[PDB]
Structure formats: structure tokens, C-alpha cells
Amino acid sequence: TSFXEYWXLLP
Amino acid sequence: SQIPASEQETLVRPKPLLLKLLKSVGAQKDTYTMKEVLFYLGQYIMTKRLYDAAQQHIVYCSNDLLGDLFGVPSFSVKEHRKIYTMIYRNLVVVNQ
């Protein structure tokens, strides 16, 4: 999983 | 003060060091929604290549502006509530 997909779950 | 329509819509004024971080990746204003702050933080981490290339939920930030604001050398993106509390210490809630 990309960092971009992990962070997208915050907002 | 009106209650924000969602948590993401809470209006905030970053404190000076967080504001400096946001401006370093192109932010232009003094007041933001929580959603905007999170997008700019994500952009900061990607442009500075702070994430572990193989295990991309790990961020390394020792002595970076980001590590100074959060008070840690590294953290996991999976720790949602820890990340929110670190961010909250670095801003003030404002009207609307």
C-alpha cells in the first residue's frame, strides 16, 4: 500500500 | 460560533512552526480547514520523501520541522488518534 493511500484514511 | 458541518471542516489557525511547514509546500493563507492541514502534511511528507519506501505507513522525521512539531523521530500512519493529538497541539480553533 502507498503512503498516499494510508494517509488518505486520516481525512 | 457555529459548529462545523464535519470534523474535517473545523477552521484552524496553525501556530508559527506548523504555519512554516505548510508555507514550505506552497500554502498561502493563515486560516485553514482541518482537511486542508492534513492534505498539506501529506504533501510535505511525500515531497520530502520521509516515508519508508518498503513499509509506507512508517514516517521518519527526526529533527525535521515535522519531528520538532510532533516531538517524535518516527511514527506510524495507522496511529490515527496519536497523529490528531500531535496536530491539535500545533493550532488554535477559530470561528465558523
Resolution (A): 1.6
Experimental method: X-ray
Sequence-separated (6 or more) residues with CB below 8 Å from residue B60: B50, B51, B52, B73, B74
Is B81 an 8 Å CB contact of chain A? no
B11-14 and B74-76: which strand pairing?
A: unpaired
* Alpha carbons B81 and B75: distance in angstroms, whole number: 12
Least CB–CB distance from A11: residue in B8, B56, B77:
B8
CA distance B27 to B91: 15
**Residue to test with chain A: of B57, B58, B60, B70, most A Cβ within 10 A:** B57
Closest CA to B81 of A10, A8, A1: A10
Closest CA to B76 of B56, B62, B90, B49: B56
CB contact under 8 A, B56 and A1: yes
Domains of chain B: which residue ranges? 1-96
Question: CATH 3.20.20.10: does it fit domain B1-96?
Answer: no
